[PDB]
């Protein structure tokens, strides 16, 4: 387009900017934070897994 | 602990503590005055603090290792040998 | 953070600018800052070598020497987890408090490595009953230099 | 091993561990001098404290 | 990286040299302390 | 208290890397700056009668 136009995004535009998706994050992190708690208690290696 | 939860009287019991206990003072003191060598040898980029922090406690390190392990055998004896409960 | 906010409402004006026109940067107090953490970040991580390097010397054996070693960053950075919970900032000032911290600290873990070794030296019992033992002797000494010490 | 200390170990580690060694016995019989004169410490302490 | 070089050979090489100066102020020190060693304490406590 | 982890080996792990989670987070959830706020705050008036 000519110069001197520019762009941006506002309010739902602007939201989905700052994160959409996390959810492949911080599932991972629950799911180390999980692979070990659940061996704070069966002390074991790898029992967790099953 | 030599003392009372060991038959021991002070002398031998401090010479058997401060001989068992020498080492790890200097395991401690060399880890730590060499984590600090950093800092005192630091140059540049904002040198101000690291140095006026680690010149402050180096010597400090040094003369509380190599000078306080020769008098905290008196202190602990004298606060006991000239003022403990003779029953 | 104030700057970092800068540099981007700036960084969206430079492609309808006139021609000849160009920004710059006489006057800056961060890049001291970046410098000034990446200082004491390096101040750090060679002073656990160091630390590696006594503990080899004295316990010379490879096992014994990643025992201290571990147990000095779960300190370190666990500091970060209870001043962020203070409302306490990761400044100039605090981050260079902890160096200082790291030097303290290291000992707290190796008194007791090194105690239950000389303890296993001369009775001879396995790592439990030693560590155990050396636990029974100690443990008590190590809240109380902590209390005496805050 | 109950009772070693490492002295029968190859290379400079041993020299090191004998010389250690050495620098605990003649700090033990220094102390042992040192704690039968509990006095002029105790006073000399109070010249470095001063 | 490469300043780690740095960091690794003043490491190895200052380990060292700390080390025996520490040991020798004892070592030093142990043998002036063992020089002038006093008579005791004095009477009005008791 | 020390003994109960000496029996139970992992469990100091979980604790410690939570702790290490928790630091690790800390940090790229915590303000970086130079200087925390050391002035008696102050308003400043201003006006301009030309």
New interface residues.
């Given amino acids: 387009l000519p110069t001197g136009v520019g762009y941006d995004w506002t309010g739902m535009s602007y939201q989905e900017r700052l994160s959409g998706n996390q959810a492949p994050s911080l599932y991972a992190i629950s799911l180390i934070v999980v692979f070990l708690c659940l061996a704070a208690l069966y002390e074991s290696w790898s029992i967790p897994f099953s | 602990d030599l003392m009372d939860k060991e038959g021991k009287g002070l002398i031998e019991a401090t010479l058997d503590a401060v001989r068992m206990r020498l080492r790890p003072i200097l395991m401690t003191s060399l880890a730590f005055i060499l984590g600090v060598m950093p800092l005192v040898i630091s140059t540049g980029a904002g040198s101000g603090a690291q140095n006026a922090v680690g010149t402050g406690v180096m010597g400090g390190m040094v003369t509380a290792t190599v000078l306080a392990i020769f008098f905290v055998p008196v202190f602990f004896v004298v606060v006991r040998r000239r003022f403990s409960r003779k029953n | 953070d104030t700057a970092a906010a800068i540099r981007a409402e700036l960084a969206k004006m430079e492609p309808f600018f006139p021609s000849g026109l160009k920004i710059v940067y006489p006057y800056d107090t961060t890049p001291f800052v970046k410098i000034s953490i990446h200082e004491v970040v390096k101040t750090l991580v060679e002073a656990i070598i160091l630390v590696f390097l006594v503990m080899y010397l004295f316990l010379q054996n490879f096992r014994a020497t990643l025992i201290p070693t571990i147990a000095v960053p779960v300190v370190l950075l666990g500091t970060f987890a209870v001043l962020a919970a203070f409302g306490f900032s990761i400044n100039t000032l605090t981050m260079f408090g902890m160096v200082l911290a790291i030097g303290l600290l290291v000992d707290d873990a190796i008194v007791v490595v090194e105690n239950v070794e000389r303890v296993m030296a001369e009775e001879g019992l396995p790592p439990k009953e030693a560590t155990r033992k050396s636990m029974g002797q100690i443990q008590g000494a190590l809240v109380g230099i902590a209390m005496v010490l805050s | 091993a109950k009772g070693d200390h490492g002295e029968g170990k190859k290379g400079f580690f041993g020299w090191f561990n004998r010389m250690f060694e050495k620098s605990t016995h003649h700090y033990t019989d220094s102390v042992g001098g040192i704690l039968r004169s509990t006095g002029r410490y105790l006073v000399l302490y109070l010249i470095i404290v001063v | 990286m490469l300043?780690l070089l740095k960091?690794?050979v003043?490491?190895?090489i200052?380990?060292?040299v700390?080390?025996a100066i520490?040991?020798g102020?004892?070592?030093g020190?142990?043998?002036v302390?063992?020089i002038?060693?006093?008579?005791?304490?004095?009477d009005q406590?008791g | 208290m020390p003994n109960f982890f000496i029996d139970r080996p992992i469990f100091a792990w979980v604790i410690a890397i939570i702790i290490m989670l928790a630091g690790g987070l800390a940090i790229l959830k915590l303000p970086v700056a130079q200087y925390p706020t050391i002035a008696p705050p102050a308003v400043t008036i201003s006006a301009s009668y030309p």
Avoid at chain 5, 36 to 42: A, D, H, I, Q
Wanted: proline letters at 7%; zero cysteines.
């Fill in positions: 300043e960091s690794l003043f490491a190895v200052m380990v060292p700390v080390m520490i040991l102020l004892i070592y020190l142990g043998e302390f063992n002038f060693s006093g008579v005791g304490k004095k406590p």
